[PDB]
Structures are given as structure tokens and as C-alpha cells.
């Protein structure tokens, strides 16, 4: 079976639609998500036209093997989609209506700059390669784009699922390709990060600052070094949920900055002890009293500066 022949010199328009049934497994490290959806295709094939009066039937059902079907592929998939044809219907004028249900692991880059307060635009790129007899061009049937109300992506809020209606037409190996961009806009449910990572991380930091109300070097060393090790455990925990980025994320910036605070608290604790041994406790008392104000104040201002640069 060959492609439908043109009346003039017009390309063949394959109208498309994607109806999401399931969204699952958004893997941040892999920058992938799994999708279960309906792919609907429609085009005119005059060779398939019939008279409903003469044939009796208003529509004709076909097996994929019996007719020409455009080879539609996904650009950003790991392996070719697992697809199962649901129906093929042909109106008297030869308008074919094809429907298949598929599943696919989609590869789509994520911007982690504002993590865990980030929003993403996931993409599903549909593509068709033209043949020598005909140039094939893709279109969007908006009445056939959508998602099931129950569609849930664990740890994310689905905002919208739309299609950029004008395809990106280009040459690849001296043949025309027509590409469509289906965009799934999502925003991360940041909630759990607050009681599990953010507040525990602040609590251990504030505990290290109790060393500014202590003259005991041994206890101070314990407070600052112990909490520093717990900070390292949180840094390791966070970086295991994320891929390695060539930029700084919001959480990464805070986590990094908090090390400087631990480092400066060790200097203070060291200086205090040194002065007391040198019989200068009055000078050490001045440094410790200033630290009580300076550490929370510089921490609050540094955080305002960071929140400003990132949001």
C-alpha cells in the first residue's frame, strides 16, 4: 500500500490528538516520565471513498494491514512506544479515523534551578517523515487533545496539557519531517520538603549557635562538629534525589552557604578558647556576644539575597 495521491501538489495533512490516561514515574535523576495515552490520527484517502447509498454502510472498519497508515513516531522516547490499535474507521468521502492506545517512557529535560519549588514543561514530540510520492505534514485536532480527570503524577500538580498547533517543519537526510510539540505543564508539590529536609536542617544549624552561649570549648567542638556531620548527611540525601547540574539549584545554594556558617562558627569557637588560654576572656566575651546577633542576622540577610536571585 502506497500513500494517498495528491489532487494538485498539496502535502498530506495528518491531524493528531493525544488523550492522557495515566502519568507516572517522573524520575528527576533520569529526566524521564512514563505515559499511557490515546493517539488519534486522521487523514483523507480518496481511494477509500464509497457511496453510503450503494454500500448500505455509513462507516467502514479496517484492519491496519488492509490500508495505508502514516508512520508516526515519537522523537523523545527511550524505546519505540508499546501501541495497540483500538479502531480504524472510513467516512464515505474517505476520511480515515485511526485510534491507538500506547505507553511510552518519555525523555524530557528538567530545570532544577528553583528546586524543590520548581515548575516544568514536559514535552511529547510527534513526528512524520515524508515519502518520495508525498510530503506529509502534521496538524492538531484540539477536540482530540486532553487528559482523564483522575490523571495524577505522584509528587506533582498537573496544570495543563496543550499542543503547539503549528508544526516545526524541517529537512533531515533530504526528506521533510513535520514535528508537533505536546506540552504537559506541571509544578512540584514542595510540601514534604519542609518537615523532612528544610526544618530539620535549620534546627541542627540553630543548635550549633548555642555554642555562642557556652564557654566550654569541649562542648562547643561537639555541638558544631556533630551538627556539621548531620548537615553532610542532609547534603548527601538531597544530592541523591537530583541529577548533577552545570548550575546551582536553590536548595544546593542554601546547603552550600550553611557550610560557610559552620566553618565560621568553628573559627569563633577556636578564637574564644585561644583568647581565654592567653588570659584575654574580656575580648573573647565581646566576640561571642557579637556572634549571638551576627550569625542569625547574616543568615537571614544571605537567605533574602538568595531567594531574590532565584525567584
Amino acid at each position: 500500500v502506497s500513500p494517498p495521491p495528491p489532487i494538485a501538489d498539496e502535502p498530506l495533512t495528518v491531524n493528531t490528538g493525544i488523550y492522557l490516561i495515566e502519568c507516572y514515574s517522573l524520575d528527576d535523576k533520569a529526566e524521564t516520565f512514563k505515559v499511557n495515552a490515546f493517539l488519534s490520527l486522521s487523514w483523507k484517502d480518496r481511494r477509500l471513498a464509497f457511496d453510503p447509498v450503494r454500500s448500505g454502510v455509513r462507516v467502514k472498519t479496517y484492519e491496519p494491514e488492509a490500508i495505508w497508515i502514516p508512520e508516526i513516531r515519537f522523537v523523545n522516547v527511550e524505546n519505540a512506544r508499546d501501541a495497540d490499535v483500538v479502531d480504524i474507521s472510513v467516512s464515505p468521502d474517505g476520511t480515515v479515523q485511526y485510534l491507538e492506545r500506547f505507553s511510552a517512557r518519555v525523555l524530557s529535560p528538567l530545570d532544577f534551578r528553583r528546586y524543590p519549588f520548581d515548575s516544568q514543561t514536559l514535552h511529547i514530540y510527534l513526528i512524520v517523515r515524508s515519502v518520495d510520492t508525498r510530503n506529509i505534514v502534521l496538524a492538531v485536532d484540539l477536540e482530540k487533545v486532553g487528559k482523564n480527570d483522575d490523571v495524577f503524577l505522584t509528587g506533582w500538580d498537573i496544570e495543563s496539557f496543550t499542543a503547539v498547533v503549528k508544526p516545526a517543519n524541517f529537512a533531515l537526510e533530504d526528506r521533510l519531517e513535520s514535528k508537533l510539540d505536546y506540552q504537559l505543564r506541571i509544578s512540584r508539590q514542595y510540601f514534604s520538603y519542609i518537615p523532612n529536609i528544610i526544618l530539620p536542617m535549620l534546627f541542627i544549624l540553630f543548635i550549633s549557635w548555642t555554642a555562642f552561649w557556652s564557654t566550654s570549648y569541649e562542648a562547643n567542638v561537639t555541638l558544631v562538629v556533630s551538627t556539621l556531620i548531620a548537615h553532610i548527611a542532609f547534603n548527601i540525601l538531597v544530592e541523591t534525589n537530583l541529577p548533577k547540574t552545570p548550575y546551582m539549584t536553590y536548595t544546593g545554594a542554601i546547603i552550600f552557604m550553611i557550610y560557610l556558617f559552620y566553618f565560621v562558627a568553628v573559627i569563633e569557637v577556636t578564637v574564644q578558647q585561644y583568647l581565654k588560654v592567653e588570659s584575654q576572656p574580656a575580648r573573647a566575651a565581646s566576640i561571642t556576644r557579637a556572634s549571638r546577633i551576627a550569625f542569625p542576622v547574616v543568615f537571614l540577610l544571605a537567605n533574602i539575597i538568595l531567594a531574590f536571585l532565584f525567584f
Copy 2:
């Protein structure tokens, strides 16, 4: 092969049944479970009618390829089910009895609010899409719904496996869909959480309170900070077995609240030391004595309040 023709204007009724053979791998993080079951289907196709006198047999066996079979799909599966046809029996009136054995990874959301004392209703949604020639509607044969006595889901108790007998019939892409809800009610075996997470977590918390019977700042700092780090290890352990939820779980609430207790114990330990250095041990003694009662009392009342809000 086309669908069976109607006598009047009646939809074709495909009776269904699901008999569970195996339940395994309830993945809390993924919100999935694996199932191995029997899917039985039954419909009338009068085109398949036969006379046992003329044919010899009283029931005819068919290969799936030989006859029209309704395209029945699962809504909430990751990939299309692994299925193997066991039997296709046709009786003289044209009634077809179809039996297949399948295995599928089912995606079903879980409510972790009361974790690890939670119950869940797992769902298996069966669906059929109508054709232009006929509207296909699903029914439940209750005599064909059940589960093997040996069906065990590691770490869970299976309560019941029933079907909501009235299908959800609705429009989807200008065709009718008939959906059935099969519900597997389960409840978590909370037992192991007690000696492995809950009691160890309470023991280390009670150990931190021994600081209220000590005047040694160095020892108190070690007791409270060391046990706090062990609490962080339990928080990390717990959160690795759970997905990130946009709500607070019972365990999460307790784990979070216990940080406040560690934070306030550090303040007490700091205050006590400060007063002793300022030559006010009588005042410090009053605060430490009150803490001995206040900490267990507030811990018990806070826990009663939490158990009330969650149960």
C-alpha cells in the same frame, strides 16, 4: 470480524469476572501492585449458533483469531496486561465463554495519612470502547468474581475483593466507554513498625531526657546531640519507604514533633549551663526539675492530640 448484530437497538452486554491467583509487590513509593488473575468474559454472538446434531459437539472450542472478541482493556495499568487465552467455549445459541489468565502492574493511589496504621482500597478498572455498529456495555457476573484462599500480599491483610456492579458509561472522543471498578480492600500489618522504628525512636528520646538529672554540660551536649542524630537516621529510614505526600502522615507528624522536643532540650541544657556559670545554680535547679515532669507530660499530651486528629 465485525461485532454481533442487534435484534432490536440493544447494546451488546459483555459479562466480566476477575478471579485473583496472586497478589504481590505492593510498592508504596510507586503506588503500584502486581496481579496474576483470571479474566473471564461472556457475550452472545448468534452468528456462531450451531446444531449439535449437525456438528457432533454440544459446545464448540475456538482460537481467538477465528471469532470476534470484545477489546477489553485495563485503565490503570502501566503496560498492557500479559495475557494467555485458556479457553473459548461457544454453546448452541451463540453464547461465548472466554477465559484468559493475565498478569499486570496496576497503578492505584494510596492514602498515607494514617501510615503505618492505614487501610487501602486498591482498584482494577476494566474498560470497553463502543464501535459504530454497536454500543458495548460491561456487566459483572458475581459467580465469576473471587480470589484464591492462598492469596497473600506481603505486609498486608486482604479484607475483600468485590466489584461495583453498575458500570460508569460515559462519552470519550465521540464514542461510548463502559468502565467497571473491581476493588481490593487491604489493611497494613503495622506490627513490625513497633519493634523496628517506633520503640527504638522512643528509647533514644527518653535517653536524651536523662540530661535533666545531670549538671554536666559536656555529657548533656553528647546525650542530646547523639540521640538527635539517631532520630535523623530514623527520619531518613522512614521517608525512604514512603512517597513524598502533599499532606502530613501520622508517623511524619510524630517524627517532626520529636525534633521540637530535641530543640527545646538543647535550650534547657544551654540555659542550665549559662545560669551555673553566672553563679545562679538555684535557678537552673528549678528549670531542670520542672523539665523532668514537663517533657514527658507535654510529650504524652501532644501524642494524645495527634492520635485524636489522625484517628
Copy 3:
């Protein structure tokens, strides 16, 4: 192809055999194991009978497609077995000898009560569903049941592989099922648990008891709290190799009991310090001296009681 016809009203006997080639991947958490074996089937088909004088041949080889073969399935498998037919031999009387090689992931529950000194009975349940024309019943050919001498299951000793010769015959969805139970008896190689978990766990416990020969609260607090944290690391290590059980395991019971010992050692260390501060060191000396005997004695007796309840 239809099933063989009966002479009288007798069921068709399908003689079975399982010869293990490989045993691997006993996953304790999943409660699964992987098997690579031979499945042999034997039944009589009179339609297939021939005279070896007239035909010349003593046996006839067949392709699966050419003859009727009973649909034999495994009950407790994750997915249907990956099978490859090795041979089909038909003798003059019509006795068919079928041989296939298969691989399957078998789901079989494990009793962890005596872990890591436990023995298990793994099961492979074979099943056949009867047809309308004939009732099919399973039998065991003992000469065709066995295992390769080289069959090794990493971390386990294989004791025996036998079959319960009488099938479980029962009705399921108004048809007869014939089920056979093939039992693989294994016992855990507990050896490695001794130098890697048990003895390290006892060493750190005995190290905490050195606090009974020390009057230094600061050092005592370090000894008891540090070793307690190492105990938590062993508890976490152990519980990651096991599924969550609605009962107590042997190791779990010991691990749990050892927490009580750490808790009571903290009370002793606290009491001793308190009395010394209250200028009562003679009383504290009496409690520490008793603890030196009481702690090992109660530890040994509690362990004897536990070993008795579990074995």
C-alpha cells in the same frame, strides 16, 4: 485439535515431572526464587496410535502444532514461564512423551521466625483446567522428578526436591482443576551471620558494659550512646535484608531485647553520677558493682529463654 476421547467415562491422566537444572536468586524480601528446569508431560492419545510393523518407525516425532497438548500452567509464578519444547515422542499405543525446558520466577512464602537459622519448603504448584469434552487429572512420574547435582542456591543448602503424588482436585468457575505440589526443601547457611552481624553486635554490647568499671560520667555517656548508635546501624542493616513480618523473628527479638540493655545501662550511668553529686558514692559503688554481675547474667538467661521459645 480436540482432547483425546474416553473409552468409558475416565478422566485423562497427564503424568508430570520437573527436573531442576538451575536454582538462583532466592529474594527474601520479595519471597521469590528463579528456576530453570525440565517439565516432562505424558498422556495417551489413541488417535495417534500406529502399527510399528506397517509404519517401519518405532516412535514418531511431532511439532507441538501437529497434535493436542494439555494446557499445563504454574499457579505461583509472577509471569507465565518462558518455555521451549525439546521433544514430543509418539509410542505405537499412542502414548505421548512431551519434554520442554522452562525458566520461571516462583512466588513462594517464607517463614522467618528462626532467621538466620531457618529452613524453608519452597513450592512449585502445577495445574490443569478440565475441558467440556474431558476431565483432566494430574499424576507424578517419580522417575522424572529430580535435580542436577551441580544445583546450588547461593546462601542455602538444598535438602530435597519431591512431589506430593496425590493432586488437589477441586472445582473453580464450574470446571475441575487438578493441582500438584512440588516441594524444594532448603536450609539457610547461617555461617556468615556469625562474624558479620552476631559477634560485632555482641562486641559493641560488651564494650558498653565497661562503663560499670568507670566513675567518669562523660566517658560512660560516650561508651553507652556510641555503641547504641552502632546497634541501631546493625538493626537497620538486618531489617533491610528481611520483609516486614506480622510476627517476631529470632534475630529481631535479640536486636529488640539489646535496646532494653542499652536503656537500663543509661539509667545506671545516670544514677551513679546523681549519687556521686549528692555525695553518696558508697551507694553508687554498690549499684555499679551489682551491675557488673547482673548485666551479663540477665543477658545470658534472657538469651536462654529466647532460644527456648524459638527452637
Copy 4:
């Protein structure tokens, strides 16, 4: 279908091309990467020649089954590539133009000597085995070699994708093999290693050196041993992201060297304490003062020497 016949005694030239669509999952431990690309093949088959005047058509489309196609394989793949034929076009002279889209897990060794500041040359080796009737030789069509602009490999920068145009022609099992080398040059995005591993590791090292401004043995022991344990946690973290190499990596060398610094700081801390107890604090003061300069100076010079040997 047999291979095309030669005019003289010339080998059959199969022109090749690889156009990358997706690059993903560069697994450092496994030394593998996943690829989704176009494989284009072109050869002449005189048997397929036609007159475009007589046949009307300018090109002829074929199904793979209809014509002879060379068996082209990948050398360094885990399993055979998952391939789907896109097009087969035949010009009037008999020049066949074959295009397939494939996905493959490619096994390619990595040099970790300069990790995490390393560059790699990933290889995709194409091969063809000659037949008895004809010797098949591979060529590169440079116009059919390339990559999608959007091609991203998480944690890496793609520099170039080129082919070594001259094949490696060699005998293997008394038949000719023609092998082509497609090279994907990449360089690691080292950025994230700086705030997550390198700077945290230096901070804890500098914290241990504060012991050189302290006369408190107890505090010193805590500072040096605690930071040493945090170093061990970083060493373990790093070595889990890398395979075991029969050579030293850059990071490995630094991580190893830093242990010697911790070991010598423990000797210093021990010596100081010993002298103070022996009533020689003047001598200890001289050693501690020298260590304040010696430790950072030797650390800086040792690092210059290492950076020189590795870069």
C-alpha cells in the same frame, strides 16, 4: 534472496550513516550509554534497476522481505539493537537507500584518570560479515552522519560525533569482516562536584587543623577523629559513583592523600599531649606552631605535584 552479483571481482560497498536522536543513561560504573538513532544504508543492486520512462515511477518503495538487505550488526552492544525500518527506496540504476530507526545499549570503556575533569570518546562499531558469493565492505556517507541539536547527555557536554571513514577490514573465522568506528566525543560537567564533594571535603580538613590552635587533647581528638569519619563518608560516596579501576584517578589520589594528613594530625595531637604530661610544654608549643604553617604549605605543594602528574 541472494547478494547482488559483481561486474568484475569487486566487493560490495555498503555506505553507512548514523544520525543521533537521543543520548541518555551514561552509566560510569557499567561503562555503558543508551542511544536512539537513525541507521542509513546504501548499496547498488543491478537486479533492481528499471527504466523511469517505461515504469512511470522515479523511485520504487520496497518492504524488507521483498529484497536482499546486508546483515549489519553493532559490535559493542549488550543485546541486538531494537530496530524499525522507516523506508527502503529503489533509484533507476538499482541504488537502494535503506533507513531504520534503532535503540541500543552501547558498551564503551571510560578512562577515569582525570575524574571528575575527564573527557571521553564513546565508540559505536558497525560491522558486516562477507558471504561466500561476495565480499562486503563498509563506507561512510558523511552527509548521513550527524546528531539532533537537542541531543543532551545529563552531566556531559557533547563535543562532536564523527566517523573514521576507513574501515578495519580483517579475517574472522575464515570470512571477511568490515568494521567502522563512529566516535562520540564528550566532556564531563565537573561543576556540581565543586560545591557537593570538593569544597565540603576541604572545609572538614581545614576544621581538623584548628586543633593546632588548641591545647585541649579531648577537644583535639574530637576535631580530628570526627572530621576523619566525615572524610570516610565522602570517600565511600565518591567510590559508589565509579567502577573499580586498576589505576589511580585524580579524586582518588586527593582523597587518599588527605588520609595521610589526618594520620599525621593525630600524631601531632598525641605528641603535644605527651610532652605537656612530661612537663615539656615549651617543646610542644614549638611543634604546634610549626604545624600551623607546615600542614597548609605541604597540602598546597602536594596538590600542585598531583595536578601536574594528572594534567
Copy 5:
């Protein structure tokens, strides 16, 4: 298609060869490795003989379906090999030359006694089952056994790939089986274990011995307990890379023995403190001075004894 008929009563000899293309994923825990190789087979089928004069052709190419091919299987594979036929060639006398490329996950036991200084002999067992018409026997064509020069097994050195030329002929389910043993001799690249596990483990052990030059119980307790916890972290790290063995490995023996050294150092530290409190520091000084020599001396001799028993 039936097997070739014998001239006399001679068995059918299938000559075999395995040429390794890729070796990868030697999983120590699973005791498996993945292989990508060529399997070549050769046998005589007189029914396939032709006159080169009459037919013109010197060799005849066949599709697997067209002729009888021996069912050759691998004994120690997880699942049946993924195989693709490269060529089937038939000389005029009827000698068939079959070549296929395959990939397989091979299950082969490993001896960890000398880990990480161990050598292994990996096995690939080829097998053929006899038929009633003929006894099929396997042979090795040594000119067709080998490996690609580029064959690399990450973390291992490949020494040789040879075949035990005489098959192990035996009865299995009343048919003769012909088995061949292909042996891949490898030796572990122990290098990385030295800077990553062995030297770090010795450094922390030597640090605990600095307690023998200290009279500070509090500091001693910190030194010995902190380093002991780091030893536990190394024990856990090592045992995660290895399966549980019913014997002691070299590393396991050293790791275990080092616990006894930590235990005895705690006794010494305890004894020293006890004597000082009892006003016997002269006696404690004698024990501490002896320990300075005794601990390194007993450590060196115990290690010589262990190296002797294991090598």
C-alpha cells in the same frame, strides 16, 4: 525435518566453537556474567549433498527453516540465549556450517576465599540431547574457539578462553546428553581495594593505638570507639559487594580479627583508668608501655598466620 541418517550405527558429531565478542557485568553477589559471542556449529547431512559441476554453485546458503539444525542449549544460563543466525552454508559433500551470534546471562559459581586477590574459572556448558533415530555427540573445533582482543571485563584480567575437548556424555530422562565445558579464566584487579578499603582500615586501626600514649580516659574512649564505628562502616561496605559464603574469605578474616584488637584496646583503656583511680598508676604505666609493642607485634604475626592459611 528429521535428523541425518547414519551410514552404519555411528553417532552424529556436531563440531562447536565459541568466539567471545563482549564480556561484561560480572556480578559477584549474583555469581553471574553477561556474554556476547559467536556460536559456530558444523555437522554432515548427506541428504543435502550436491554435485558442484551440475549445480554450478560451490556452496549453498539456507534459511534455518529449510533444513534440520541440532537443538543446542546452554546449561548454566538464566533464560534461553538471545540468538540471531548469521549464516548457514552447505559444501558439496553435505557438510553444513552454521554461525549464529548470541547474548546470554551465564550463572557460574565463584570462590571468594582469597577475595579480593582471587582468580576464577567461569564456565559456559553447551549441551545437545539425543533423539530416538540418532545419538547426537558434541565436539570442539579449536580453530573456531577464541575471543576478540578488545574483550575487557571491568575489574578483571582475562587470562584464557579454552574448551575441554572431550564431552561429558550421560543419561537424563532416558536420552543421552552430550555436554561441553568452555572455560574463561579470569583474575581480579585487586589494585583499588588497597587505597579504598585496606589502607583506610589500617589507618583508623593505628589511630586507635595512639590511646597507648595517652592517660586521658575520655580521649581514649573517643579514639577507640570512634575508630571502631568507622571499622563497622568498612565491614558493612565490604559485605555489600559480596554474597554470604559458608566459609571465611581473606578480607572477612582480617575485618573480623580487627574487632578483637578493638575489644582488647577497650579492655586496656578501661584497666589503665581503673588502676589510676585505685592509685596504682605505676602498674597502669607498665601495661600501657607493653601495649605499645604488643598490639603492633601481635597484629603483624596474626596477619602473617592468616596470609599463610589463605595463600
